[PDB]
Design a protein around this ligand. Structure first.
Ligand SMILES: *[C@@H]1O[C@H](CO)[C@@H](O)[C@H](O)[C@H]1NC(C)=O
Ligand SMILES: Cc1ccc(CN)cc1
Ligand code: NA
Ligand code: NA
Lengths: 250, 11, 29
């Protein structure tokens, strides 16, 4: 996260770290959506251009964390993966369209002050809140600058950007399964996700029911925190029918 | 530099 | 979950985090 701040304890209790077993390293963010299900970006698990194709046994998820590098004894919980599910129309060849994946845990994680699921949006919450100017919140342990790494989880609040501005900022083809967020050059505030934050959540706090909803997944950006560029996020509501199908079937 | 995690999670 | 999105250390205790108000102030509708 670029130009963010240290999270408060328990501020993002749905935060998940995707952790490579060997070498032991941070791979991506993710989020807890139930006691057995974790949501992330497909490209965190499958990206053939970089020879990335993880299997369940390659990975662990670490839940309830605050410190990036410490083993947070009596606080974090470490879970093994039963099965990975990648959206069948995830477009890794072109533009990361439908950049979404689910991971089912081998056993349920116990909730605590530090471990608690985020809500997924309904159509009405999405329609009300996914509007240009409305701010969401991005969290992660990724790099602090494009070109360095944080002691603890970082947080930044960023405004959703008008779709024509998103499209006009890039040569990549933007789809309805993406939205973008970040400040414009003229706005005099900054911030973005960066490498290591992808797969983590973009959340909004509904003013109707005071609950946090995951509206986006950190998906891609051209660099980090560049003037005139924006971060792109998977549109969670648009893909919720797939989410529901996977959880209902499996 | 990540602190080693308990071996139980790697078995 | 029925309890989703309500943080034990914040919403469940009626405590506000240091920047959530920035989000609310942007929801101009
Ligand atoms: C990814 O690897 C699995 C092997 O576990 C294979 O079945 C699958 O076809 C691979 N997909 C791609 C796009 O390489
Ligand atoms: C949203 C977002 C922003 C920056 C990156 C890193 N290039 C990834 C994802
Ligand atoms: Na364009
Ligand atoms: Na930018």
């Amino acid at each position: 996260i670029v130009e963010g701040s240290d999270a408060e304890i328990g501020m993002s209790p749905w935060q998940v770290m995707l952790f490579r077993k060997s070498p032991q390293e941070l791979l991506c963010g993710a989020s807890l959506i139930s006691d057995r299900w974790v949501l992330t970006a497909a490209h965190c698990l499958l990206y053939p251009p970089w020879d990335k194709n993880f299997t369940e046994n390659d990975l662990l998820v670490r839940i309830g964390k605050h410190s990036r590098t410490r083993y947070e004894r009596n606080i974090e919980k470490i879970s093994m993966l039963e099965k990975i599910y990648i959206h069948p129309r995830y477009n890794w060849r072109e533009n990361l369209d439908r950049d979404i994946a689910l991971m089912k845990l081998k056993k349920p994680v116990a909730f605590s002050d530090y471990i608690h699921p985020v809500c997924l949006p309904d159509r009405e919450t999405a329609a009300s809140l996914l509007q240009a100017g409305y701010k969401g919140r991005v969290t992660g342990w990724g790099n602090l600058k494009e070109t360095g790494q944080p002691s603890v989880l970082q947080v930044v609040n960023l405004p959703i950007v008008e779709r024509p501005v998103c499209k006009d900022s890039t040569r990549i083809r933007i789809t309805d399964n993406m939205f973008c967020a970040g400040y414009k050059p003229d706005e005099g505030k900054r911030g973005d996700a960066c490498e290591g934050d992808s797969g983590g959540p973009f959340v909004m706090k509904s003013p109707f029911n005071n609950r946090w909803y995951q509206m986006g997944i950190v998906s891609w950006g051209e660099g980090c925190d560049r003037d005139g560029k924006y971060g792109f996020y998977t549109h969670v509501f648009r893909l919720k029918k797939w989410i529901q199908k996977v959880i209902d079937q499996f | 530099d990540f602190e080693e995690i308990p071996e139980e999670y790697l078995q | 979950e029925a309890d989703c999105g309500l943080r034990p250390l914040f919403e469940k205790k009626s405590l506000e985090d240091k920047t959530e108000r920035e989000l609310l102030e942007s929801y101009i509708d």
